[PDB]
Design a protein around this nucleic acid. Structure first.
Ligand SMILES: [Mg+2]
Ligand SMILES: [Mg+2]
Ligand SMILES: [Mg+2]
Ligand SMILES: [Mg+2]
Ligand SMILES: [Mg+2]
Ligand SMILES: [Mg+2]
Ligand SMILES: [Mg+2]
Ligand SMILES: [Mg+2]
Ligand SMILES: [Mg+2]
Ligand SMILES: [Mg+2]
Ligand SMILES: [Mg+2]
Ligand SMILES: [Mg+2]
Lengths: 55, 57, 142, 57, 75, 141, 144, 185, 100, 66
RNA sequence: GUUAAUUCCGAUAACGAACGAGACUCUGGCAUGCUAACUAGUUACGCGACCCCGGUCGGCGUAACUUCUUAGAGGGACAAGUGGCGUUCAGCCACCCGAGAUUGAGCAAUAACAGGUCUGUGAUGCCCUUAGAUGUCCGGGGCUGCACGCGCGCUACACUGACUGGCUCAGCGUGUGCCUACCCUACGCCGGCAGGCGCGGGUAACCCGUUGAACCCCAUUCGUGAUGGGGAUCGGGGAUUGCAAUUAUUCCCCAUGAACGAGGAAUUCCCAGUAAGUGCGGGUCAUAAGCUUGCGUUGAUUAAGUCCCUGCCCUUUGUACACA
């Protein structure tokens, strides 16, 4: 049926399973320290998180 | 746009600021992207004091 | 009776070597083994340099134990080289007269500044856009 | 805590908490004069002060 | 163009020449012996080790890259 | 007397290899003569009794520091992994060869398994190591 | 020993392939196809051979023993993982094949791929990279 | 030996520098001779601090070249030591004196440059640098693709340069540069 | 009796003020106190591209986040530790009180 | 180049104009004097101002300053 | 005139100013002094083990202390002292004392490009489509295709090297997840290896881990031969990840053993712990480093200058250019 083909592909791995938590896109994801967000929004919200370019 | 930037700048100079910089970018008086810039007062740009001496929006 | 313990560190780029002088006989050992077996053996006379410059009479009354960590081979060798000399200078400053300390300091300085003064040169940070600190990647026109 | 998260992930999660908080209140309190937030995380109580201009609004 | 056809083992004349002239050389090292006698370097090293076993040459400083031998003492 | 640290180690491991040649009861495995000692090595060793020499090296490493299991043995016997067209990296050694070395040194009492994991060295092995240290000292004197 | 002995073979002849007697035995066997450095050292170790000797000093009954050990790996205690025809398709026997049957079984494997008409056999017939290589930038010196 | 210094087994004294032009720029006598040609560094900080570096250390530093050998100073200390052994066992003199004579003979007194090329006489420090480069380049060219080792080649090049028999590559390039500068002046 | 306060903070001088205030509180309440033991700090390093797209010169950011962890051992019952940690806390410092 | 800027030089001239009696020849004395009398936020700027104070005091002991 | 600098001195129809540079922040080093420490240790003791009173132990436990450990407040260096040059001003060079007498990065002004990004966005105007969809889901393929050319890189062309054993030293770091299904691994057996099977430790100065990393050092084998250099291509087999590896995902074993003998015109990057050699972490990662970003080891040649080329910044000059 349609219920057995709509969301039956395995999403246990890969970059298509995870996404950004702002853009929900699947490119340039920062998975380090559980950020799980793209580098553009990381540059956007690094001041709000606490990251700062000291050196 | 001009009167609104004049009003915002006059209000913040009435409140009391060391200096300001109002940049309105976009399409004005036509299709070509014209960017207006209103600067007066003491305003610093470079160095570590830009982190905690100015407020940027 | 009184313990004449002198603990003096010596630093290269990363290697830190702490020498320890006491009252005793003329034996010098580094990490539980003497100076005659510290590889590479090409820098054996470099290890023997304070003994060869000062004679066995100065080192006869001092026993030196050195604990070493960090760096590479030449770094640890030059670290213990600096550290045993600085430890002997500090021991002769603390427990005997300052004139012999000044003469031994003159003998060490007239040979090499590295025996007493550490080198402040350390590794420069690598920058983005290059395989090293100063070098860049190969720029390709056209 | 039973999940036992590390401090490396915990301060990052608090930063993303403050970021999503600031963005949500920027989108929602925009017409009312939003100016910021300040969150004091105490044990068993979470004080979270909206800093804004028009308190009646 | 050029090819070095060195001897893998001793000829009789080359062995007599190594017994005659090589303990009279000031440089007794296997590369120089191989260059002068057109033999292998390993063959030269085994030859100098057996000359050490016989007792006609004097060791100066041996090493994993190069061993150094010279003549016997003069007096 | 003397310890093994006053002794030059390069001839000391060969002297303990000669001591294991003199003893001859380590119960060597059957696959000694044909195996390659690591995944990063390319050939078999030139020496026919590499097992005794590496057991000597294992004895002096466990004398210097104990609690070294099979992972630490592969760490001390790792090396360059020449990947050919790719750049080289560090590669750990073979596990089973040092495992058989530790089983031989547990068979004849030179090492003993210690609590909280690892192999330490027994006082009988310390006695044998200091006796052969005195032997190499008397040889170099 | 150090001089040239009697009956010194400058070139040995084993399995229609010349062997340089100047070269050391564990490397002089490597001129034969199907045997390399590792399997040569395994054969010389499983036989009672001083491997310091050259390939001209050793005797003819002993090189016949070397030939029998190289032709029969299983019967002289060599494991199955030193072999280049582990679990063959046609007969299923762990064996070491030397310098003519190697090319024969290679062209028979190419003929089997040609018969089954696989993509692997098609890339072999075309003369291209079959293990999945990128032929866009490399492989130009072979084709003109 | 606390008073007099021994370069390995070699004496500091009895090293006569023939050229008085190369007296200060050859740092070999009574202050700069050490136990090993290895050292810590700092000689490349100031301009004329390179002249105070000892000449055996300068040969040790200039020997390590061509990619695969950059940063093997213990290894080229071994090379220079065995080369001094071969120099003593061939010539029968002081290897330090042979090296000083090799620098004096191999150093070109003039060169030519663009001010058409005009010839000018070079600085003595530049002459020492050119000699150290040329004899090292000749030794490496003799050692590349050869049975003769690098210590034997460096010993033969230093002995041929101290002799001046025109069989050394350094002496040949010195004569070539001197002849070109004699021509275009 | 042996109660362990762990102080984790991003700012430096605020954490120093908090640990000094805990030292002054222990000195006023008269208990055996250990010194403020510093841990080696952690530098969370992120290196991304400056450009949102990929077309530009190869420029790279260095986003740093330094976190610091001090610890203070107290020889006192639980109510004293709760009374000390209840008073004068500021948002930069996270406090973890271990009983054992 | 170790060239002093105007924020060093004018502030040092104001310090010497207001506190000529307190300042002296020794760098480590009049550096602490300038630290006491002037609110300087950073040690490097403080050292620059104190060094230019010492140099102008040498100029004053040599002769008149414009 | 001076400076890395529109940096200052000084002249002066200019005066008073402002951004930038500088100043600032972080990093690197020096403080046998202050604060600290059972998630770092030190040295003394008490035992234990071994060798002939003494030596070793990262074997155990405790007695003061912080030299080594880490991180906080401070301090220290400023052309300050001397000798010269210089309007005796701005400043420049050398030297003594000394850990430094130019450590490195971040930030970075006005004005602009019709430079890149609508394929980062639930930033977006307009246009197109909107159910037989350019929306969304599933299966397979492709993004890897190969007569050709270019660019960034890796491997090398060997004897200053390769192979085989022995010795011996690091620092950045990271590590069990909101969805999320995927962590670092000690140790004991099975197997040659890739790996597999069980007990543990670790949310991290606790465990991996004293991070037993390479280059290098020592000792054999090789002998100038496209050779034991080099490992491309290709056959046979064995394992892990995943629902699924065929167009070989990767890894391991045997075998096959190509060009390449230091590279033409042309051209890149760099001057001190620098280039280069060399290995280790993060990102992409279920499986995964020839890339990139950081770190550590060994560690130099030559230069302290110039506008010759390529360009840049001031002043004057000329212009028939001003999308210059
Ligand atoms: Mg500014
Ligand atoms: Mg700035
Ligand atoms: Mg190793
Ligand atoms: Mg050669
Ligand atoms: Mg455009
Ligand atoms: Mg699909
Ligand atoms: Mg592509
Ligand atoms: Mg091409
Ligand atoms: Mg090879
Ligand atoms: Mg080959
Ligand atoms: Mg990439
Ligand atoms: Mg005109």
């Amino acid at each position: 049926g349609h219920q057995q083909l709509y969301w039956s592909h395995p999403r246990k791995f890969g970059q298509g399973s995870r996404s950004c938590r702002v853009c929900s896109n699947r490119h340039g994801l920062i998975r380090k320290y559980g950020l799980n967000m793209c580098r553009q929004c990381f540059r956007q919200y690094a001041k709000d998180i606490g990251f700062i370019k000291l050196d | 746009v001009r009167r609104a930037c004049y009003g915002v700048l006059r209000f913040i100079m009435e409140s009391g600021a060391k200096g300001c910089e109002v940049v309105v970018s976009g399409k004005l008086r036509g299709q070509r992207a014209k960017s207006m810039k209103f600067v007066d007062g003491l305003m610093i740009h470079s160095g570590d004091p830009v982190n905690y001496y100015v407020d940027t929006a | 009776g009184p313990l004449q313990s002198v603990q003096v560190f010596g630093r290269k780029k990363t290697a830190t070597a702490v020498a320890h002088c006491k009252r005793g006989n003329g034996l010098i050992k580094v990490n539980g083994r003497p100076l005659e077996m510290i590889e590479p053996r090409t820098l054996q006379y470099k290890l023997l340099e304070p003994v060869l410059l000062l004679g066995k009479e100065r080192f006869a009354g001092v026993d030196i134990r050195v604990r070493v960590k960090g760096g590479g081979h030449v770094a640890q060798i030059y670290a213990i080289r600096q550290s045993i000399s600085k430890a002997l200078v500090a021991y002769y400053q603390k427990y005997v007269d300052e004139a012999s300390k000044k003469e031994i300091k003159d003998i060490l300085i007239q040979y090499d500044r590295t025996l007493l003064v550490a080198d402040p040169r350390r590794c420069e940070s690598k920058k983005f856009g290059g395989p090293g600190a100063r070098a860049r990647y190969q720029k390709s026109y056209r | 805590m039973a999940v036992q998260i590390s401090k490396k992930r915990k301060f990052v999660a608090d930063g993303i908490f403050k970021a999503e908080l600031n963005e949500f209140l920027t989108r929602e309190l925009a017409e009312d004069g939003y100016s910021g937030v300040e969150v004091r995380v105490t044990p068993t109580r979470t004080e979270i002060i909206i800093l804004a201009t028009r308190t009646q609004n | 163009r050029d090819k070095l056809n060195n001897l893998v083992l001793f000829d009789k004349a080359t062995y007599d020449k190594l017994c005659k002239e090589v303990p009279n050389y000031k440089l007794i090292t296997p590369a120089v012996v191989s260059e002068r006698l057109k033999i292998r370097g390993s063959l030269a090293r085994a030859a100098l080790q057996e000359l050490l076993s016989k007792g006609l040459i004097k060791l100066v400083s041996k090493h994993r890259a190069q061993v150094i031998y010279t003549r016997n003492t003069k007096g | 007397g003397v310890t093994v640290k006053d002794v030059n180690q390069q001839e000391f491991v060969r002297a303990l290899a000669a001591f294991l040649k003199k003893s001859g009861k380590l119960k060597v495995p059957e696959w000694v003569d044909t195996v390659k000692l690591a995944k990063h090595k390319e050939l078999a060793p030139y020496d026919e009794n590499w097992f005794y020499t590496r057991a000597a090296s294992t004895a002096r490493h466990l004398y210097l520091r104990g609690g070294a299991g099979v992972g630490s043995m592969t760490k001390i016997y790792g090396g360059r992994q020449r990947n050919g067209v790719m750049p080289s990296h560090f590669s750990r050694g073979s596990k089973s060869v040092a495992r058989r070395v530790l089983q031989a040194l547990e068979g004849l009492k030179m090492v003993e398994k210690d609590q909280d994991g690892g192999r330490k060295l027994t006082p009988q092995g310390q006695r044998d190591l200091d006796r052969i240290a005195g032997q190499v000292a008397a040889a170099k004197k | 020993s150090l001089v040239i002995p009697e009956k010194f073979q400058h070139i040995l002849r084993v399995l229609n392939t010349n062997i340089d007697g100047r070269r050391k035995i564990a490397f002089a066997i490597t001129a034969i196809k199907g045997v390399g450095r590792r399997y040569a050292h395994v054969v010389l170790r499983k036989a009672d051979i001083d491997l310091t000797k050259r390939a001209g000093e050793l005797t003819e009954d002993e090189v016949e023993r070397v030939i029998t050990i190289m032709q029969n790996p299983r019967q002289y205690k060599i494991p199955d993982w030193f072999l280049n025809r582990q679990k063959d398709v046609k007969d299923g026997k762990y064996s070491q094949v030397l310098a003519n049957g190697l090319d024969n079984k290679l062209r028979e494997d190419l003929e089997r791929l040609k018969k089954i008409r696989a993509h692997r056999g098609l890339r072999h017939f075309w003369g291209l990279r079959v293990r999945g290589q990128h032929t866009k930038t490399t492989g130009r010196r072979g084709r003109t | 030996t606390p008073d007099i210094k021994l370069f390995g087994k070699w004496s500091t004294d009895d090293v006569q520098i023939n050229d008085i032009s190369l007296q200060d720029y050859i740092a070999v006598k009574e202050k700069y001779a050490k136990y090993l040609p290895h050292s810590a560094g700092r000689y490349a900080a100031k301009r004329f601090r390179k002249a105070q570096c000892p000449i055996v250390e300068r040969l040790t530093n200039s020997m390590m070249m061509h990619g695969r050998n950059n940063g093997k100073k213990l290894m080229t200390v071994r090379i220079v030591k065995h080369a001094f052994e071969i120099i003593h066992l061939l010539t029968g003199e002081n290897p330090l004196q042979v090296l000083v004579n090799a620098i004096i003979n191999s150093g070109p007194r003039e060169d030519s440059t663009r001010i058409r090329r005009q010839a000018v006489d070079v600085s003595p420090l530049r002459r020492v640098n050119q000699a150290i480069w040329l004899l090292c380049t000749g030794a490496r060219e003799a050692a590349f693709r050869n049975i003769k080792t690098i210590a034997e080649c460096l010993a033969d090049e230093l002995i041929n340069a101290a002799k001046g028999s025109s069989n050394s590559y350094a002496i040949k390039k010195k004569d070539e540069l001197e002849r070109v500068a004699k021509s275009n002046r | 009796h042996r109660i362990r306060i762990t102080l984790t903070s991003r700012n430096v001088k605020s954490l120093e003020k908090v640990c000094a205030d805990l030292i002054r509180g222990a000195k006023e309440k008269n208990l055996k106190v250990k010194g403020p033991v510093r841990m080696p700090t952690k530098t969370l390093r992120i290196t991304t591209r400056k450009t949102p797209c990929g077309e530009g010169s190869k420029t790279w950011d260095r986003f740093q986040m330094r976190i610091h962890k001090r610890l203070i051992d107290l020889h006192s019952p639980s109510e004293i530790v709760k009374q000390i940690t209840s008073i004068s806390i500021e948002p930069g410092v996270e406090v973890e009180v271990t009983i054992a | 180049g170790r060239v002093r800027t105007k924020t060093v030089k004018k502030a040092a001239r104001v310090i010497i104009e207001k506190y000529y009696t307190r300042l002296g020849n020794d760098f480590h004395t009049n550096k602490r004097v300038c630290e006491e009398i002037a609110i300087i936020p950073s040690k490097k700027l403080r050292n620059k101002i104190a060094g230019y104070v010492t140099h102008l005091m040498k100029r004053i002991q040599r002769g008149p300053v414009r």
